[PDB]
Design a protein around this ligand. Structure first.
Ligand SMILES: [Cl-]
Length: 306
């Protein structure tokens, strides 16, 4: 296969084992190391998929950051790790960390951003930032502070892409898919701009930038996916599957659409597929691109914030 999986190094694997020890010592269980009843230690299997892009209900709007229901759902699905990636905030982190531990889940720390870059002018693009280690966590905190400190208008807090140069250490980036700088430029056929953007990530985020692939039945998602996979194969860039999770169950879609409208003051930016899909569901969805699934599990092992 010419699609790259970025494997956690021996050092990262050791940090992952230590991070699971912490889950287990604080919580009294660890789903990653759990043995099903009538199963055996010898027949235990690794996770096939981990959610790395997940928002609480009020993430980009006004309201509380309740992360309890996301942990509750992940625990019910037997998920051994979960990221919360709320919009330019870490509100729910302290509670997510504790609840994660209580449920035997490895908590992964991240946030979603709107990004501005000179190459794209004034246009805002999507980026997900994961903290791989405590230095990354500190840098993620600093990046959020920087976005607020320079102030914002109705468009909300924004980061400059170039701020990532100085703040890069311990961060793993998910590209934003069709909404990211690379994705938008792929959809527009701007090969020269794709090349400039990819050069930035290769320089500052070596093995720490993933082309995000998303299948939620929204416009341009699959056309972008085709182009991203072609780019990934030609450049050796790793792809990663996410489900851009915005609510817990598919039946929650109705309430989500309405919460967004109230805040907006009224545009169909969201799909009913953006729920917390099971590992089995995600594996079937990306059966044709198993590398996109494998990279979620490797990224999950690489993310160890204590
Ligand atoms: Cl098992």
């Amino acid at each position: 296969s010419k699609l790259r999986v970025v494997f956690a190094t021996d050092e990262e694997i050791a940090a992952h084992e230590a991070r699971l020890d912490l889950v287990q010592k604080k919580g009294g269980s660890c789903l990653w190391r759990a043995t099903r009843e009538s199963g055996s230690i010898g027949s235990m299997s690794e996770p096939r998929f981990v959610h790395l892009r997940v928002h609480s209900d009020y993430s980009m709007i006004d309201g509380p950051a309740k992360t309890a229901p996301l942990v509750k759902k992940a625990a019910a699905l037997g998920m051994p790790a979960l990221a919360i990636t709320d919009f330019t905030n870490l509100c729910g982190l302290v509670k997510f960390y504790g609840a994660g531990h209580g449920a035997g889940i490895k908590p992964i720390v991240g946030a979603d951003f709107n990004v501005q870059c000179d190459l794209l002018g004034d246009e805002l693009t999507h980026l997900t930032v994961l903290a791989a280690n405590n230095t990354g966590y500190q840098n993620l905190t600093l990046l959020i502070s920087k976005a607020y400190q320079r102030g914002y208008g109705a468009a909300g807090p924004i980061i400059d892409r170039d701020w990532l140069i100085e703040l890069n250490e311990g961060l793993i980036l998910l590209s934003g898919g069709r909404m990211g700088d690379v994705g938008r430029s792929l959809l527009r056929g701007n090969s020269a701009l794709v090349d400039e953007c990819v050069a930035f990530y290769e320089e500052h985020f070596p093995d720490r930038y993933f082309l995000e692939l998303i299948r939620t039945g929204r416009p341009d998602e699959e056309s972008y996916l085709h182009a991203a996979v072609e780019l990934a194969e030609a450049r050796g860039l790793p792809v990663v599957a996410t489900n851009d999770v915005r609510f817990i169950d598919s039946s929650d879609f109705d309430a989500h659409e309405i919460r967004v409208a109230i805040h907006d003051g009224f545009p169909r930016n969201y799909s009913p597929q953006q729920y917390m899909r099971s590992e089995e569901e995600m594996c079937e969805l990306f059966a044709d691109i198993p590398e996109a699934l494998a990279n979620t599990v490797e990224i999950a092992k690489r993310c160890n914030v204590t």
